[PDB]
Design a protein around this nucleic acid. Sequence first.
RNA 1: AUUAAUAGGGACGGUCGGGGGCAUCAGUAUUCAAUUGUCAGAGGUGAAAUUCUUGGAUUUAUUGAAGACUAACUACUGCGAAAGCAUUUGCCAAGGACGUUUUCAUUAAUCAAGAACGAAA
Lengths: 175, 101, 111, 124
Amino acid sequence: ESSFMTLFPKYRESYLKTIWNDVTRALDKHNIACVLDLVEGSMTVKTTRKTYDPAIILKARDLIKLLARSVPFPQAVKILQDDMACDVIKIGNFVTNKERFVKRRQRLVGPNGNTLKALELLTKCYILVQGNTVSAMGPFKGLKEVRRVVEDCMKNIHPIYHIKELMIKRELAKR
Amino acid sequence: APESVADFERLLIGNPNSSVVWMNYMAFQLQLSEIEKARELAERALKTINFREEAEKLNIWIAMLNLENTFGTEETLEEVFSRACQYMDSYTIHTKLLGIY
Amino acid sequence: NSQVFGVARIYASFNDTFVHVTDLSGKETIARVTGGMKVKADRDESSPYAAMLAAQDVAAKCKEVGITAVHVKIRATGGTRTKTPGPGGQAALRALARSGLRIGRIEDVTP
Amino acid sequence: LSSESVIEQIVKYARKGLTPSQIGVLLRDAHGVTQARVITGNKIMRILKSNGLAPEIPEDLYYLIKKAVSVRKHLERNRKDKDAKFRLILIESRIHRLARYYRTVAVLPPNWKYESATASALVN
RNA sequence: AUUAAUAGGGACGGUCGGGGGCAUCAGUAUUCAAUUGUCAGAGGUGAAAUUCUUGGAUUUAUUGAAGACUAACUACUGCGAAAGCAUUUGCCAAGGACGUUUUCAUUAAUCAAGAACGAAA
């Protein structure tokens, strides 16, 4: 039937194997077939005829990619609920060489993780930087600022422009 | 003028970078109904001329194509086309070919 | 079982929810029920609750015509867009399943 | 092992149309010999010069002067070959220092004037 | 012929690279056109506005034409003189590391002047 597959690096599969038995313990509650292909290093979210709706497989397919993007499986666990949707942004096509790509990588993170946690307190999302992705998960009116911050900061734009608009909109919130 | 088999060949020792002699020699060779000595001449003037002369080198591919325009073949003018497309520019020989066609 | 089925294209994008379940061939969709038609504020087009209200009409027009099953070809934006599945997926596809319409060999077939 | 016979093997090998490294690579592969510096007591290029089998240009230079003219053929195929012309500016500095060695160490005269124009005449 | 700087050129052979020039074929993604089913919205926004819309906006599917790039695999991975660099495969020429009791014996080190490549517009 349905199947959505995602490949993983070496960093999360060992972290998956402590939770993939819990993933199959949790996917069985919605009757979804989860594969732990240790030979392939990939997981596939498959549908079953004992399930209610096929939409929860794709919501777990975002959770399986969140499980494969070195985000926590507890942090990927809330995606199966209604009012929490993820945003697995690929930011690979920004700079070819590793020099200027790593220049904007820490600038989207900041010194001691303050600026990466700043957008977490600005746009209300779980920002997860692992490898060449910037994954977020939250309300879409807050998550619209997440894709606006992630797509422009891999270019020559800094997060100081993003946070200052976010600090102004948060201050005029209570009115 | 150079009108013999020995005449235009002697000028090649004095004028190596001159394809204009082979441009008249290919008019002097294929006029005797044997263009195999004229197709040899455009092949010889490629390996005899200096590589720094681009005005005669691209014209050498334009000479063997315009000779191929009336007195050539179907795939022989195209095999000389993709040989000029590797040794020289693509569309500048094709804009020459658009004027030739 | 008799396989009274078509194909269901649900556009669960980031800005709206458009549902156009097609036939066994790609043309001649028997149903086309928008999410912004069942809620009139121009802001609830991406809401799944308006998409769940829209999904009752989506099951209705096929059950009126004769398609008792629908295989889901789910759609996010894809391509040169945000490429991720939005909010309108988990409610609109479930309400077709809550209406007894048989799901089987479902897919996400966006760009 | 009859020391002059390795020279008589070289006297046919230098007459076989090969470089001095080619006589040293072949004799060390199929004849057991170590080098020209071995007990026979004569250099590979100097024994070829002593019997009239030496070349016209230096073997250090003539394989580099040929490599300067041959690499210009790809640059004659594309003037946008920005690395092959960069290799051509470098390799023409490799043969120029070689001929400047022979001009001072009296293997070539100081009026030779090595140029990439006539280097196709000294490669063939 | 004082030695063959565990200096250097040059030569062989096993390797390798997202190197570059050319070519090969493969890949998704986009626009426009031909056209069917159907519409009260579609897009955009914090809420709107703006934009197209029984001129069918909009969704699906199909065909044609054109332009760009190699996501996940894929990374502190190698390479390119630097700039820069990712489908399959080749042509041509260039290159890191390799071993020779292979060849030369300083041919070798920094570069004003002066010239070549070349990041944005």
